[PDB]
């Protein structure tokens, strides 16, 4: 049974992460924030939640929505790093993998800044704390393929995923990196994570890979140079769409074909039919995470917490935008399942 | 973005237009609302001037700008008290935690 | 003087433009904000600093005519660096569908910017004339 | 007329919007950084005035100087002192501070006419 051996290594971690989950803003707290009508009032109201005084260093006048988002995300990352510190063995590998996605994001950001004529010194101020690694500034030697895996990326944990350098090439490299990383992490979950967490993380990673696959399939229609072979190379092999719907998406070269491919899958049909697609993807993610919190002795609770807290940071930011911009007529467009 | 204040020239010209080419139902209603609103859209003023062409253009200009939104108007008194308590706690934090 | 009536009309064309400039930005910002939301596909999150490219030569160039006492300014395509700016944010696969709406609003603002500059200059010329 | 470039002193979000519009970070030739990213609560009047002078006096190719209106309201005195025709200044609305006609020089100047 899961709880028989889970609490040997992950008892404290799971308890603390469950406390963090208890700290997620409930719909009532989101409504109270929504009632706020200025950024300083939002800061006061947000001090009453588990966010506490995270904005104590910011004066009421210096407060801005970017600072709110940055500070909430810094709190989230400090909490995640704390949970990672207490982690060991398979749990530590699980959290390292969680950070691998942000490492890939940081690689892409650094190379995009490099082609964009921004020095690495200033770009490191933008890199996520989770994705930091030693050779991060050394990877972006130049705007050529000799960078990354050729010189420095071999020392990074992303090295196995690398098996010109224009903006389009940058995005293709990033999407290939996510594809390989998601496949590798699905494999690690299947081979090394206990059964409840195994299935929960398998479902969550299937949804993540499907979100990607769908987004790439839809966006590559916009006069992109990615041929269907490259698209097939960009779609992960782990999603709920794999292999039938993934193949249909890869070959489809029109919106109607993509919609037909999605209609094949029960879990996603209806997402592309109506409403904003990203809203549907976020709602599905939140429902999956809320389900993931019903399982007690599962390390998926960590992932479910991260993607939950991350969503929270968006919501608190979106409200902070609508309050800042006086766009109150859409202040309720956030997703909150708690 | 802004209307024209209903100065003496504005009031006199609106009264004349009420019994002039601008005596149309819609134009007359707009003029009456402006008199109630103490200002008229200046595009409507130009339209009335065209209709008359009468009165001179010189006048004591005063632009009625769109009122600034009042922040916190929809706050409930309970919400106001909650914000006041949180503000008091934040003010205390500066030295209680020192 | 009858010309004052024209001034009012001029001001009207200014006022409407301001409102058409009040929108576009107003919309262009909120969709831009809604693009920070939907940040999963973004490189880092908020669209802003760390996304810009100093190597980006402006796609838009403004020409000053100086053909009369009233200064007249126009904006056109600039005469590779001259690329569509949305690609700066990862425009082929990663930009949210709302960043495109934000770009549309901000582009729609530019002709209004040129118009507003022109009307401001004409109003100042008339003010100095009267 | 050689003036063919645009200069902006603005907030990060307004600058992002202008970049999305098509304005570039540097001039087509002899490119130099033409964007000053004003930050609320972290920039004194001196810096804003210095960059305004940089864009208005030097950089002869700058036809248009787009300024977020709150930045101008911070340094309204310097803008009022400024007087030229080759470079044209235009206040534009910001994310948190929409365009405010009560802080527009044209409104006051026209009101001074009394007609």
Swiss-Prot record, chain A:
InterPro entries referenced in this protein's UniProt entry, alphabetically: ATPase_csu/dsu_sf, ATPase_V0-cplx_csu/dsu, ATPase_V0-cplx_dsu, V-type_ATPase_csu/dsu, V-type_ATPase_csu/dsu_dom_3
GO cellular component, one term: vacuolar proton-transporting V-type ATPase complex
UniProt keywords, alphabetically: Acetylation, Hydrogen ion transport, Ion transport, Membrane, Transport, Vacuole
One annotated GO molecular function: proton-transporting ATPase activity, rotational mechanism
Signal peptide feature range: none
Pfam families: vATP-synt_AC39 (PF01992)
Membrane is among the record's keywords: yes
Residues annotated with N-acetylmethionine modification: 1
Family that this chain belongs to: Belongs to the V-ATPase V0D/AC39 subunit family.
Other comment: Present with 1630 molecules/cell in log phase SD medium.
Function: Subunit of the V0 complex of vacuolar(H+)-ATPase (V-ATPase), a multisubunit enzyme composed of a peripheral complex (V1) that hydrolyzes ATP and a membrane integral complex (V0) that translocates protons. V-ATPase is responsible for acidifying and maintaining the pH of intracellular compartments. This subunit is a non-integral membrane component of the membrane pore domain and is required for proper assembly of the V0 sector. Might be involved in the regulated assembly of V1 subunits onto the membrane sector or alternatively may prevent the passage of protons through V0 pores.
Assembly and oligomerization: V-ATPase is a heteromultimeric enzyme composed of a peripheral catalytic V1 complex (components A to H) attached to an integral membrane V0 proton pore complex (components: a, c, c', c'', d, e, f and VOA1).
Name of the featured protein: V-type proton ATPase subunit d
UniProt source species: Saccharomyces cerevisiae (strain ATCC 204508 / S288c)
Upper lineage: Eukaryota, Fungi, Dikarya, Ascomycota, Saccharomycotina
Curated annotation (Swiss-Prot), chain B:
Taxonomy of the source species: Eukaryota, Fungi, Dikarya, Ascomycota, Saccharomycotina
Protein name: Vacuolar ATPase assembly integral membrane protein VPH2
Function: Required for vacuolar ATPase assembly.
Residues of the full protein shown: 1 to 106 of 215
Localization in the cell: Endoplasmic reticulum membrane
Organism whose genome encodes this protein: Saccharomyces cerevisiae (strain ATCC 204508 / S288c)
Further details from the record: Present with 2030 molecules/cell in log phase SD medium.
Segments on the Cytoplasmic side according to the record's topology features: 1-98
Curated annotation (Swiss-Prot), chain C:
Entry-linked InterPro entries: Vma22/CCDC115
Domain of life: Eukaryota
Statement: the UniProt record of this protein carries the keyword Methyltransferase: no
GO terms (BP aspect): vacuolar acidification; vacuolar proton-transporting V-type ATPase complex assembly
The entry's keywords: Acetylation
UniProt keyword annotation of Cell inner membrane present: no
MF terms (GO), sorted A to Z: unfolded protein binding
Record's GO cellular component terms: nucleus; Vma12-Vma22 assembly complex
Note: Present with 752 molecules/cell in log phase SD medium.
Biological function: Required for V-ATPase activity.
Protein name: Vacuolar ATPase assembly protein VMA22
Originating species: Saccharomyces cerevisiae (strain ATCC 204508 / S288c) (Baker's yeast)
């Amino acid at each position: 049974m899961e709880g028989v051996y889970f609490n040997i290594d992950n008892g404290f971690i799971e308890g603390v992460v469950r406390g963090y989950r208890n700290g997620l803003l409930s719909n009532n707290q989101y409504i109270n924030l929504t009632q706020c009508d200025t950024l300083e009032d939002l800061k006061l109201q947000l001090s009453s939640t588990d966010y506490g005084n995270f904005l104590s260093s910011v004066s009421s006048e210096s407060l801005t929505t970017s600072l709110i988002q940055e500070y909430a995300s810094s709190k989230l990352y400090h909490e995640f790093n704390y949970i990672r510190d207490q982690s060991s063995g398979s749990t530590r590998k699980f959290m390292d993998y969680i950070t691998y996605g942000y490492m890939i994001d940081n690689v892409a950001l650094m190379i995009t800044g490099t082609i964009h004529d921004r020095d690495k010194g200033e770009i490191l101020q933008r890199c996520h704390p989770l994705g930091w690694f030693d050779t991060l500034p050394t990877l972006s030697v130049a705007t050529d393929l000799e960078s990354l895996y050729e010189t420095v990326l071999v020392d990074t944990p992303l090295a196995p995923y690398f098996k010109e350098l224009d903006d389009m090439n940058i995005e293709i490299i990033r999407n290939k990196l996510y594809k390989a990383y998601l496949e590798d992490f699905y494999n690690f979950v299947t081979e090394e994570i206990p059964e409840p967490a195994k299935e929960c993380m398998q479902t969550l990673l299937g949804f993540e890979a499907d979100r990607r696959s769908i987004n790439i399939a839809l966006n590559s229609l916009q006069s992109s140079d990615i041929d269907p072979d490259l698209k097939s190379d960009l779609l992960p092999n782990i999603g709920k769409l794999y292999p039938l719907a993934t193949f249909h998406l890869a070959q489809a070269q029109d919106f109607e074909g993509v919609r037909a491919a999605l209609a094949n899958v029960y879990e996603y049909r209806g997402f592309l039919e109506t409403g904003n697609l990203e809203d549907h993807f976020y709602q599905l993610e939140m429902e999956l995470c809320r389900d993931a919190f019903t399982q007690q002795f599962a390390i998926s609770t960590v992932w479910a917490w991260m993607k939950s807290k991350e969503q929270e940071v968006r919501n608190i930011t979106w409200i902070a935008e609508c309050i800042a911009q006086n766009q109150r007529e859409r202040i309720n467009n956030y997703i909150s399942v708690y | 973005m802004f209307e024209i204040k209903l100065n003496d020239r504005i009031t006199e010209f609106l009264r004349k237009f009420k019994n002039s080419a601008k005596s149309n139902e819609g134009i007359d209603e707009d003029i009456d609302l402006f008199l109630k609103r103490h200002a008229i859209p200046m595009q409507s003023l130009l339209f009335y001037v065209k209709e008359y062409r009468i009165k001179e253009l010189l006048k004591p200009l005063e632009f009625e700008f769109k009122p600034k939104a009042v922040r916190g108007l929809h706050y409930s008194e309970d919400f106001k008290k909650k914000l006041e308590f949180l503000k008091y706690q934040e003010q205390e934090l500066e030295y209680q935690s020192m | 003087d009858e010309q004052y009536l024209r001034l009012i009309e001029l001001l009207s064309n200014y006022d409407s433009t301001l409102e058409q400039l009040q929108k576009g930005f107003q919309d262009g910002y909120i969709q831009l904000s809604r693009s920070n939301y939907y940040n999963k596909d973004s490189l880092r999150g908020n669209y802003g600093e760390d996304y810009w490219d100093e190597t980006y030569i402006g796609q838009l160039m403004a020409t000053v005519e100086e053909k009369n006492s009233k200064v007249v300014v126009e904006i056109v395509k600039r005469k590779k660096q001259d690329y569509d700016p949305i690609l700066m944010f990862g425009g082929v696969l990663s930009v949210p569908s709302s960043l495109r709406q934000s770009q549309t609003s901000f582009k729609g603002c530019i002709p209004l910017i040129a118009q507003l500059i022109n009307y401001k200059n004409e109003i100042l010329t008339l003010v100095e004339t009267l | 007329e050689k003036r063919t470039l645009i200069a902006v002193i603005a907030d990060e979000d307004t600058t992002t919007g202008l970049l999305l519009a098509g304005i570039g970070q540097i001039t087509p030739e002899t490119q130099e950084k033409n964007f000053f990213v004003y930050q609320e609560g972290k920039t004194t009047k001196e810096e804003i005035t210095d960059k305004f002078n940089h864009f208005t006096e030097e950089r002869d190719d700058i036809a248009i100087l787009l300024i977020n209106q709150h930045i101008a309201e911070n340094i309204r005195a310097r803008v009022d002192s400024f007087t030229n025709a080759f470079p044209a200044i235009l206040e534009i609305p910001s994310k948190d501070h929409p365009y405010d006609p009560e802080k527009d020089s044209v409104l006051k100047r026209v009101r001074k006419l009394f007609g």
